[PDB]
């Protein structure tokens, strides 16, 4: 077992963590026990992997052994094993696969995935105009887009921003995210005893998911009725079709129950994540007009006025792609990614990690490597640009994590970020209330995810 601070009887290693910034806490601890150390929280023992070296040697090289999902008392209470985000064994590789392929640009019908995002970007811009250039909070708008995107990929179509169903869904998605991100929820995951004495909070979430899932099930039924085995409209159809195919083995991991959960998983996995990054991206663009202006020039060069942007233009716009990467590397949305777990006994280094041991990877240590990224604390699009000005990749770019568990929506997220942002910059100018040299882009890490400080900006139309 890897070294680490001795844990007290009931509070474990809690006194070693500054809840106001768990991420940072782990980094400081690595400055003592190295890139690999053990920790104890509640009844959960965990091994922290800090530093690119150990992170790659685990997620990549030893991919299969670290392909397991960390123990989640909360997730296992709400999903019970179903879904993608928290499934395992056969069940995981099963749903995962189908999801990966069904999500391919043309993995679910004649209509491509990009066509949906494109349309949403059209609405996103259409709504921004409504603000009439007046000071406003992009928090809401930037949230409807990513959410509506998933909706159009799961259901036959999207929803009007006014539609109540939509509002109920997003409002319910926010409450659920707040809950799970609270320090209290973190405590229950580790110590499942206290949750029985104070079920209140967990019940609210379970209730929200229950209602959310029911509404899904219903639509899943509306599909079954008008399904076209040879003309899939969305995820549901594909899944439903897949069922008909494996209607011969009683071991088919594909069931209506797994669909509902999976649908819910994706829905909650692509909203907050993408939404927060977009809102953070704009904030950074206000702080750095110099950078915003350049992107606009590249959009002006490679795209022009007569045409809206598309994914084919990304490979042509090296600078714009750099900013998108820098924004992700800088904000470090998920400091510690999602809890992992060794599928068996692994002799990582001199230390041996027992089967089923929770593994916490510090993506922060990778995305903020002072070496691969000089001055990782500063926002600079240069980090992903060579001397010539061409885009340069990096094995240190793991916002979506890495390994057999890498984000299922990595291609979808990047597609949205690029299109959404470029659409906005091509139609509007970014002017903030107070001076761009004043407002601070510093995060407010909630522990589970980083959140940008509150701010307001104005969307000034570019007519030409
Ligand atoms: C900019 C936004 C996003 C970021 C930064 C992000 C990041 C990540 C990360 C770090 C993980 C955990 C990987 C691990 O367990 O090692 C993950 C999981 C996942 N994400 Fe995303 N993600 C984003 C958007 C999306 C979107 C748009 C979708 C929906 C299609 C989505 C779907 C998922 C799913 C299904 C998983 C669980 C995968 C598995 O365990 O097999 N994500 N994401
Ligand atoms: C709590 C929870 C998180 C995620 C998920 O994909 C997220 C990940 C990996 O990071 C996030 C940051 C903000 C909001 C959601 C996520 C996915 C599910 C199914 C959950 O129950």
UniProtKB/Swiss-Prot annotation:
Superkingdom field: Eukaryota
GO terms, molecular function: (R)-limonene 6-monooxygenase activity; (S)-limonene 6-monooxygenase activity; (S)-limonene 7-monooxygenase activity; enzyme binding; heme binding; iron ion binding; long-chain fatty acid omega-1 hydroxylase activity; monooxygenase activity
Pathway: Lipid metabolism; fatty acid metabolism; Terpene metabolism; (4R)-limonene degradation
Effect of residue 199 to L: In allele CYP2C19*10
Subcellular location field: Endoplasmic reticulum membrane; Microsome membrane
Keywords, in A-Z order: Endoplasmic reticulum, Fatty acid metabolism, Heme, Iron, Lipid metabolism, Membrane, Metal-binding, Microsome, Monooxygenase, NADP, Oxidoreductase
Chief place where the protein resides: endoplasmic reticulum
Gene3D superfamilies assigned: Cytochrome P450
Cofactor(s) required for function per UniProt: heme
Reaction equation(s) it catalyzes: an organic molecule + reduced [NADPH--hemoprotein reductase] + O2 = an alcohol + oxidized [NADPH--hemoprotein reductase] + H2O + H(+); (5Z,8Z,11Z)-eicosatrienoate + reduced [NADPH--hemoprotein reductase] + O2 = 19-hydroxy-(5Z,8Z,11Z)-eicosatrienoate + oxidized [NADPH--hemoprotein reductase] + H2O + H(+); (5Z,8Z,11Z,14Z)-eicosatetraenoate + reduced [NADPH--hemoprotein reductase] + O2 = 19-hydroxy-(5Z,8Z,11Z,14Z)-eicosatetraenoate + oxidized [NADPH--hemoprotein reductase] + H2O + H(+); (5Z,8Z,11Z,14Z,17Z)-eicosapentaenoate + reduced [NADPH--hemoprotein reductase] + O2 = 19-hydroxy-(5Z,8Z,11Z,14Z,17Z)-eicosapentaenoate + oxidized [NADPH--hemoprotein reductase] + H2O + H(+)
InterPro entries hit by this protein: Cyt_P450, Cyt_P450_CS, Cyt_P450_E_grp-I, Cyt_P450_sf, Cytochrome_P450_fam2
Effect after changing residue 23 to G: In allele CYP2C19*19
Family: Belongs to the cytochrome P450 family.
Protein name stated in the entry: Cytochrome P450 2C19
Organism of derivation: Homo sapiens (Human)
Gene name of the encoded protein: CYP2C19
């Amino acid at each position: 077992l890897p070294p680490g601070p001795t844990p007290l009887p009931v509070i474990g290693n809690i006194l070693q963590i500054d809840i106001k910034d768990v991420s940072k806490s782990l980094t400081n601890l690595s400055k003592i026990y190295g890139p690999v150390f053990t920790l104890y929280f509640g009844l959960e023992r965990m091994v922290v992997l800090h530093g690119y070296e150990v992170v790659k040697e685990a997620l990549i090289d030893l991919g299969e052994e670290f392909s397991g999902r960390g123990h989640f008392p909360l997730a296992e209470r709400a999903n019970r094993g179903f879904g993608i985000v928290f499934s395992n064994g056969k069940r995981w590789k099963e749903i995962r696969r189908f999801s990966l392929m069904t999500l391919r640009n043309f993995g679910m019908g004649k209509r491509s995935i990009e066509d949906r995002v494109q349309e949403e970007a059209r609405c996103l811009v259409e709504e921004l105009r409504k603000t009439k250039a007046s000071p406003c909070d992009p928090t809401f708008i930037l949230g409807c887009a990513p959410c509506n995107v998933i909706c159009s990929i799961i259901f036959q179509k999207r929803f009007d921003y006014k539609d109540q169903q939509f509002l109920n869904l997003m409002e319910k998605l926010n409450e659920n995210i707040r809950i799970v991100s609270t320090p209290w929820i973190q405590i229950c995951n580790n110590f499942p005893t206290i949750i029985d004495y104070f079920p209140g909070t967990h019940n609210k979430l379970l209730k929200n998911l229950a209602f959310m899932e029911s509404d899904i099930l219903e639509k899943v039924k509306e599909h079954q009725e008008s399904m076209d085995i040879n003309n899939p409209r969305d995820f549901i159809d594909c899944f439903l079709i897949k069922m008909e195919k494996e209607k011969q083995n009683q071991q088919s991991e594909f069931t209506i129950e797994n669909l509902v959960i999976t649908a819910a998983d994706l829905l909650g996995a692509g909203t907050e994540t993408t939404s927060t990054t977009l809102r953070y991206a704009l904030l950074l663009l206000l702080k750095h007009p110099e950078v915003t202006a350049k992107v606009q020039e590249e959009i002006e060069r490679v795209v022009g006025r007569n045409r809206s942007p598309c994914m084919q233009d990304r490979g042509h716009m090296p600078y714009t792609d750099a900013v998108v990467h820098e924004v992700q590397r800088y904000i470090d949305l998920i400091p510690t990614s999602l809890p992992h777990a060794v599928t068996c006994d692994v002799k990582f280094r001199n230390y041996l990690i027992p089967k089923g041991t929770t593994i916490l990877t510090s993506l922060t240590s990778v995305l903020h490597d002072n070496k691969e990224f000089p001055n990782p604390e500063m926002f600079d699009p240069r980090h992903f640009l060579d001397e010539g000005g061409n885009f340069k990749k990096s094995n240190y770019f793991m916002p979506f994590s890495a390994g057999k568990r890498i984000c299922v929506g990595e291609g979808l997220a990047r597609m949205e970020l690029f299109l959404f942002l470029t659409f906005i910059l091509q139609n509007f100018n970014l002017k903030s209330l107070i001076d761009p040299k004043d407002l601070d882009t510093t995060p407010v890490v909630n522990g589970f995810a980083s959140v940008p400080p509150f701010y307001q900006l104005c969307f000034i139309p570019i007519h030409h």
